[PDB]
């Protein structure tokens, strides 16, 4: 039978069938529960909502993400999310399909072990596999060499790969992703007069981010231009009809990716992280890595992100190096597309962990 | 000349001179307009009353606060309040004294800009400065490391400070303060048959809160005790001789600080807010923050607030660490006391914004 | 057995059986007592009268309402009213039917407790329930979302409901209803030369109000028109044959709903109260509340009330909001109709308070 590919990231769940071109189900990884007292009898009032249903009813619900920074924090909510994905979105029998999951690098072992246990026991899947997302991004890109920069909702990581060989010592992970930018934007909108404090309001700020934010090619000159003119301002309409005007906050939000000190982090920017990762590799490899910077994930969808990354890397790298950044139009689903490609390959069918192997050797099999 | 310190709170105005141990002028931030029509011609009736005189005449006036949630909403009323405090209360010429003002963190920029514009253009103050209330609360305590929980009439906030360095990424703010507690007390007093609907009766309810409310160490135990005996009931005499008895309303009102869901907000209580602020800081300074939990502002004056907060934080924080809450007797005036200390230091005499600087750099100077 | 539904409002008693389309008995909530000396021994003078009996004999009686502003103030008279309703109007044995009662939100707790105690220990009902009138209005309107503006004889209240979840922190209430308009009309009619001072004449004035009053779309323009022409005047014939002409008093009376200052109240009009209640709800809720303004109760029967409400709300709310007001032709009995619908639902039969629960828990059970 065809295999399932479920890229359950921090922000969105992308699920589908191996070999299919694009994910079939794409819904936010959200579980909402009512925060008010019900007064009308019956009328189909459920005790919890998941995915797109929770988004529609977010006015009366308190929304919680089961995954934070790529680590599952509430396993009941995660079981709920997987149950939704399999039964209501895909509408398939889990026991009929082997499922391919994904995980970020440098994650706790207990996370993967518990995920495997839930998949085999609660859903009775025949076989499963857990893959590193940055590796699947390269499969999606259709090349075996390059340094992937995957930036989702929870984590940002770099994974150099050369001729199909990974370099685990050069893997970099940065706990700063779309959610932190959303929180910074929430903080930064207050100085202009708007207050967004509830979980539901945090979803409006995320939409403002996804619609109006962009990366400035030169931060100081952009700030000066914004201060000296209103040409950069845009307007956005809230669900209740109130209209807000956002100015230099448009590019100050994603600028946190390059200056994490804006949110009090001591780490370096994504450009510095990629350059450091490249320099961790052997001297004979760096030339090929400079020319194959593959970007992935939703957070790399800001306008001007690729140009800013290229400018910064060219500044850090020595001249005579051909810095080139590959930004496919479908970066958002590149991890899922790669998972689809990987699960279809004939040479991969031996990598599945069958339930026999799992139960005869324990959860630790998933670390092989 | 001696500087002026004016702690423009959202519920009270506290003004005085730098160096004094207590503010000279303390009156409610209130402006009242007559709502009936006069019939007597020989009186010196005037169209607006401010401060104490508005409280004395509240029967025939519609009282309205110009400041809500630390944000000035009516600028004509605020100008009237400032004129009153400068001339009728302090009896000074503003042009002869530098003025130190205060504000809550995460406020709109336009608020500071307009405050500075009014201070320089209307009152012709020679120089002025706008400080953050929580920072001055630390000066009032003499120490330089601690996490300040300032809770006034409109806004509650946390500000962690370590060795004189503020950690702005850890600042927290709730729009839940004495005003909301007064409104909730008005709501729940109806359960016993008492109806307060007018703005002048809101002041009566505020007095009831200030005189009879207290914080329960264990909320459910008190709820059980109240239902079991009348030992908790107290009587209050209204301005017209009526006597009203309130029971569990005494500690249900301030409980809203720890369970904001009582008023429909999904925010976390003040204990959770301070704990989260501490955990936003570096692991190496948390031990010092836990031991220097400072309180300030009027709403931190409920009996048993300190013990309840200590118990809650001790529950949240790991053991083997000394949770200690500093609740001085002068919590109400701590912000103004600190502002008095700061305005007198010889090291601060170069931080004033001079009229010469302002009238050439523009209103944006106040954000330095 | 069939359940009884009794809507004990301040003005009228509407009683009937669940499942019927309209109330069976609708009579004023009046108790009259003779105020002169009987001189004919043979006649059945009778010591007190109730409902229509009192209304038809109002010439020799002094009429008293046991309910004032939705609160029962004379419990003997209310027991008399209920005895009339059960035995003379419906002609049923109350011990054979469960009864569904109603009351306004934010009422004193003792009101429900005394009501339950009288119902269980005096009439020996098998089970009973006490609902919120604004909630039953939605059942009658057959929808799950909306903000109900219920305005009867004693009390006006707003209750936002979303997907069957009530927002009790946004519930508003005004003590300004049909009775206050009747009193204002009595006062206003004096300036034209008509004096109505007795209780029996209050009923004539109430009839005049029901017959001739209407809401002006633009109050100032209407006042200007009436002062320049007699086209707006109408004539009314009193019981003794005197004819009185009424001019701009026709629309000045119901204008008190929008300008409570006419009767000395500083509260906001019903339009402002509805808008404020909407703005108390979460920003994702407001779109639906604006489109489902539900009106119920007698005082919402003034011609032009719906158009005036729509115009005022449109003025207050932001543009691009589809403000719509639902005004069923049976607004008067919407609360009773909803109670009938609710009491007949199978899913509701678990919510009855059986007398066993009252015995083993006392009156306190009714607050769960």
């Amino acid at each position: 039978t065809t295999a399932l590919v479920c890229d359950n990231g921090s922000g969105l769940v992308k699920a589908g069938f191996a070999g299919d071109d694009a994910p079939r189900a794409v819904f936010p990884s959200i579980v909402g529960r009512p925060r008010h007292q019900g007064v009308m009898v019956g009328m189909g009032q459920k005790d919890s909502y998941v995915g797109d249903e929770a988004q529609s009813k977010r006015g009366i619900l308190t929304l919680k993400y089961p995954i934070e920074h790529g680590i599952i924090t509430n396993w009941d909510d995660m079981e709920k999310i997987w149950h939704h994905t399999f039964y209501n979105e895909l509408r398939v029998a889990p026991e009929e399909h082997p499922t391919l999951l994904t995980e970020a690098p440098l994650n706790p072992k207990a996370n993967r072990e518990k995920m495997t246990q839930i998949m085999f026991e609660t859903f009775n899947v025949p076989a499963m596999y857990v893959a590193i997302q940055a590796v699947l991004s390269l499969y999606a890109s259709g090349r075996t060499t390059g340094i992937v920069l995957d930036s989702g909702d929870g984590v940002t990581h770099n994974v150099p790969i050369y001729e199909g060989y990974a370099l685990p010592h050069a893997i970099m992970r940065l706990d700063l992703a779309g959610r932190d930018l959303t929180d910074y934007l929430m903080k930064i909108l207050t100085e202009r007069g708007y207050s967004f404090v509830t979980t539901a309001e945090r979803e409006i700020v995320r939409d403002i981010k996804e619609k109006l934010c962009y990366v400035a090619l030169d931060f100081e000159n952009e700030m000066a231009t914004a201060a000296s003119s209103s040409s950069l301002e845009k307007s956005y309409e809230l669900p209740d009809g109130q209209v807000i005007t956002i100015g230099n906050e448009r590019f100050r939000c994603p600028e946190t990716l390059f200056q994490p000190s804006f949110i009090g982090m001591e780490s370096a920017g994504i450009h510095e992280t990629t350059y450091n990762s490249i320099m961790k590799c052997d001297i004979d490899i760096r030339k090929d890595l400079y020319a194959n910077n593959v970007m992935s994930g939703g957070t790399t969808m800001y306008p001007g992100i690729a140009d800013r990354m290229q400018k910064e890397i060219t500044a850090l790298a020595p001249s005579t190096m051909k810095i080139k950044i590959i930004a496919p139009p479908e970066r958002k689903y590149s991890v899922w597309i790669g998972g689809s490609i990987l699960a279809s390959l004939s040479t991969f069918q031996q990598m599945w962990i069958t339930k026999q192997e799992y139960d005869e050797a324990g959860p630790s099999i998933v670390h092989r | 000349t001696t500087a002026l310190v004016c702690d423009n709170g959202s519920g009270l105005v506290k003004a005085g001179f730098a160096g004094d141990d207590a503010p000279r002028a303390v009156f409610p931030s209130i402006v009242g307009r007559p709502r009936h029509q006069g019939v007597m011609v020989g009186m010196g009736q005037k169209d607006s009353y401010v401060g104490d005189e508005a409280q004395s005449k509240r029967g025939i006036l519609t009282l309205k606060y110009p400041i809500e949630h630390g944000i000035i909403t009516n600028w004509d009323d605020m100008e009237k309040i400032w004129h009153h405090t400068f001339y009728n209360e302090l009896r000074v010429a503003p042009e002869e004294h530098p003025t130190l003002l205060t504000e809550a963190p995460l406020n709109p920029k336009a608020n500071r800009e307009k405050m500075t514009q009014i201070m320089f253009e209307t009152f012709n103050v020679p120089a002025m400065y706008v400080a953050i209330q929580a920072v001055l609360s630390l000066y009032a305590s003499g120490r330089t490391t601690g996490i300040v929980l300032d809770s006034g009439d409109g806004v509650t906030h946390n500000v962690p400070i370590y060795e004189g360095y503020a950690l702005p990424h850890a600042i927290m703010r709730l729009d839940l303060a004495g005003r909301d507690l007064t409104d909730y007390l008005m709501k729940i007093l109806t359960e016993r048959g008492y109806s307060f609907v007018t703005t002048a009766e809101r002041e009566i309810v505020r007095d009831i809160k200030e005189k009879l409310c207290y914080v329960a160490l264990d909320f459910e135990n008190e709820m059980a005790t109240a239902a079991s005996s009348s030992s908790l009931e107290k009587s209050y005499e209204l301005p017209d001789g009526q006597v009203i008895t309130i029971g569990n309303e005494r500690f249900r009102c301030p409980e809203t600080l720890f369970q904001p869901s009582f008023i429909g907000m999904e925010s976390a209580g003040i204990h959770e807010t301070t704990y989260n602020s501490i955990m936003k800081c570096d692991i190496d300074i948390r031990k010092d923050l836990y031991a220097n939990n400072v309180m300030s502002g009027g709403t931190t004056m409920y009996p048993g607030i300190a013990d309840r907060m200590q118990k809650e934080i001790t529950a949240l924080a790991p053991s083997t660490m000394k949770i200690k809450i500093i609740a001085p007797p002068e919590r109400k005036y701590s912000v103004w006391i600190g502002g008095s200390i700061l305005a007198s230091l010889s090291t601060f005499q170069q931080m004033w914004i001079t009229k010469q600087e302002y009238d050439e750099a523009g209103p944006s100077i106040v954000h330095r | 057995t069939t359940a009884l539904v009794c809507d004990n409002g301040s003005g009228l008693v509407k009683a009937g059986f669940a499942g019927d389309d309209a109330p069976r008995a609708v009579f004023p909530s009046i108790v009259g007592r003779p105020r002169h000396q009987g001189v004919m021994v043979g006649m059945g003078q009778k010591d007190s009268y109730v409902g229509d009996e009192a209304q038809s004999k109002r010439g020799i009686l002094t009429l008293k309402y046991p309910i004032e502003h939705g609160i029962i103030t004379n419990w003997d008279d209310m027991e008399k009213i209920w005895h009339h309703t059960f035995y003379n109007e419906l002609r049923v044995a109350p011990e054979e039917h469960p009864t569904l009662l109603t009351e306004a939100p934010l009422n004193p707790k003792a009101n429900r407790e005394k009501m339950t105690q009288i119902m269980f220990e005096t009439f020996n009902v098998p089970a009973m329930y006490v609902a919120i009138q604004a909630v039953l209005s939605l059942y009658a309107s057959g929808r799950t979302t909306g903000i109900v503006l219920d305005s009867g004889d004693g009390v006006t209240h707003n209750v936002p409901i979303y997907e069957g979840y009530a927002l009790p922190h946004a519930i508003m209430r005004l003590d300004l209803a049909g009775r206050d308009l009747t009193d204002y009309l009595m006062k206003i009619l004096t300036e034209r030369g008509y004096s109505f001072v007795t209780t029996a004449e209050r009923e004539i004035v109430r009839d005049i109000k029901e017959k001739l009053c209407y809401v002006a779309l633009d109050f100032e323009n209407e006042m200007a028109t009436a002062a320049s022409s007699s086209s707006l005047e109408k004539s009314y014939e009193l019981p003794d044959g005197q004819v009185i002409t009424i001019g701009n008093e026709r629309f000045r009376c119901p204008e008190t709903l929008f300008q409570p200052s006419f009767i000395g109240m500083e509260s906001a009009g019903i339009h402002e109260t509805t808008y404020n209640s909407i703005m108390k709800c979460d920003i994702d809720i407001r779109k639906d509340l604006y489109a489902n303004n539900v009106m119920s109760g007698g005082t919402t029967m003034y011609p032009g009330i719906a158009d005036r409400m729509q115009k005022e709300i449109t003025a207050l709310a932001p543009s691009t909001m589809k403000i719509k007001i639902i005004a069923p032709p049976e607004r008067k009995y919407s609360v009773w109709i909803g109670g009938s619908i609710l009491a007949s639902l199978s899913t509701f039969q678990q919510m009855w308070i059986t007398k066993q629960e009252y015995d083993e828990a006392g009156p306190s059970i009714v607050h769960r």
Binding site: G193, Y194, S195, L238 | - | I283
Partner: peptide, 7 residues
């Protein structure tokens, strides 16, 4: 309330 957008 007393802000510019929400609250």
């Amino acid at each position: 309330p007393a802000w510019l957008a929400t609250c």
